[PDB]
Design a protein around this ligand. Structure first.
Ligand SMILES: OC[C@H]1NC[C@H](O)[C@@H](O)[C@@H]1O[C@H]1O[C@H](CO)[C@@H](O)[C@H](O)[C@@H]1O
Ligand SMILES: [Cl-]
Length: 485
């Protein structure tokens, strides 16, 4: 029965550490984490905000608040998943917690605005640095990749005690906005609202130069980005690019989609190679986060996935390519939407979160990866938990041994007083029991080996062999066999 146990983590509040980099929630979190422990929770997840830690200047890392937070977590006896959060928290009208990337990095942007992902109207998105500057030494002598590597190295050195004590068990490497490996193709601040197709965010001068060179390398120097793609809030059929039998299918469209999605893959590969080197020999898993772009999954162009950078079509597996890139690093996939049913979604959005989840989990498992999941949106109801349970053990319980497939972990978004009071807590606690296959909490489950060095670098052509033939997912049971109620 023990092979069925799925670990449950809970995300901490976005302001677990204050926006001024002070630890202020000692008493509150102590009581809240005690409730989590009483409920059987294996660990917590937390954003380690770049804007807080390296906020005062290059290499001025102030870890003092995170250390206090981490001691609290260790004192509670909980495991810890640390997100290298190289992205802005909040920043939209109405957001409660607002933590931009370091001011001194934004200061570079006042002179070189092309450090930011840029749309076709020229709007600069300040939430994250363009993958176009990964290897450009623009930041007081450092490249973006060097800044990420140096931050992770400082983290390791300063948190060594927590790593050695087995408190920190997972490093989630932020690779884009919201920590997700994607482009910022659906920004509320630029006027997007659900379920707009989004936009291609490749207009910064660095990416423009990259495209031109890539185009010349295949004999077509003349080529430009597609200009029949509409705008953020369009539907696919309103554009010549994304409509059925549209220009996304052309030789030109295919080249562009490949270039855009490949650049995201290369960004992840090169940052994971550095992260692996940093954490070599520590008993931790490295993970990336893939965003759950479920809208337009039911139309041929998969338009919102394409603009996010996931080149996914009925005959092209745009997630298995990503999974193949992760293999050499022994990195895990952290996906979302684990809580969603298709019946809960708007019809006109053409949304299929269940099939998308099935596609991403199946891709990870076919590449031999650990796969974990999060809920996309806040949920406290038994139906949500039953959906997560279904995704956690897609073929149900194996009474003989471990199941054919299971999630390596699930991380719940997110801790607050609401979760640990009233009927919410009862529902949550029962969820954790079921995730644990009704066994008691086992802190020693899923032990990590010392992280080995990433295997040999493989080319983009090698990675892309995973795109086709596109396979049906593994069959998933309609309903969990171990529901909450
Ligand atoms: O965890 C990543 C995102 N998954 C999909 C959710 O809808 C979204 O809200 C999540 O992003 C938030 O939480 C992250 C972890 O706390 C944080 O890094 C990110 O900035 C968002 O606040
Ligand atoms: Cl295969």
């Amino acid at each position: 029965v023990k092979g069925n146990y799925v670990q449950v983590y809970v995300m901490l509040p976005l302001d677990a550490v204050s926006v001024n980099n002070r630890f202020e929630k000692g008493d509150e979190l102590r009581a809240q984490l005690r409730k989590l422990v009483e409920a059987g929770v294996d660990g917590v997840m937390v954003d380690v905000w770049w804007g807080l830690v390296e906020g005062k200047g290059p290499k001025a890392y102030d870890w003092s608040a995170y250390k206090q937070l981490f001691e609290l977590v260790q004192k509670a006896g909980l495991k810890l998943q640390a997100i290298m959060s190289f992205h802005q928290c909040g920043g939209n009208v109405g957001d409660a917690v607002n933590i931009p990337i370091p001011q001194w990095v934004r200061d570079v942007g006042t002179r070189d605005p092309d450090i930011f992902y840029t749309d076709g109207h020229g709007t600069r998105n300040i939430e994250y640095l363009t993958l176009g500057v990964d290897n450009q030494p623009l930041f007081h002598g450092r490249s973006a990749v060097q800044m990420y590597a140096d931050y992770m190295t400082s983290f390791r050195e300063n948190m060594k005690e927590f790593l050695d004590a087995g408190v920190i068990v997972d490093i989630e490497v932020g690779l884009g906005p919201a920590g997700e490996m994607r482009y910022p193709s659906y920004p509320q601040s630029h006027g997007w609202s659900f379920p707009g197709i989004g936009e291609f965010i490749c207009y910064d001068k660095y990416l423009q130069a990259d495209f031109k060179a890539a185009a010349a390398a295949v004999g077509h120097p003349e080529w430009e980005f597609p200009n029949d793609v509409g705008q953020y809030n369009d539907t696919p059929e309103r554009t010549q690019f994304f409509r059925d039998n549209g220009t996304y299918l052309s030789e030109k469209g295919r080249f562009f989609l490949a270039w855009y999605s490949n650049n995201l893959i290369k960004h992840g590969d090169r940052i994971l190679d550095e992260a692996n080197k940093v954490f070599l020999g520590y008993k931790v898993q490295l993970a990336i986060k893939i965003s759950g772009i479920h809208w337009w999954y039911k139309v041929p162009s998969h338009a919102a996935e394409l603009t996010a950078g996931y080149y996914n079509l009925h005959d092209r597996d745009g997630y298995r390519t990503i999974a193949r890139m992760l293999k050499r690093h022994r990195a895990s996939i952290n996906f979302t939407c684990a809580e969603m049913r298709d019946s809960e979604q708007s019809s006109q959005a053409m949304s299929a979160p269940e099939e998308l989840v099935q596609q991403v989990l199946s891709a990870g498992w076919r590449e031999g990866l650990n796969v974990a999941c999060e809920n996309a949106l806040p949920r406290y109801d038994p139906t949500a938990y039953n959906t997560i349970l279904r995704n956690a053990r897609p073929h149900g319980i194996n009474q003989s041994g471990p199941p054919e497939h299971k999630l390596f972990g699930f991380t719940y978004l997110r801790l607050s007083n609401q979760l640990v009071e009233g009927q919410n807590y009862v529902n949550f606690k029962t969820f954790v029991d079921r995730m644990h296959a009704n066994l008691p909490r086992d802190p020693y489950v899923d032990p990590m080996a010392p992280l080995p060095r990433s295997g040999p670098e493989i080319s983009i052509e090698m990675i892309l062999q995973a795109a086709q033939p596109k396979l049906q997912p593994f069959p998933f049971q309609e309903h969990t066999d171990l529901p909450v109620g």
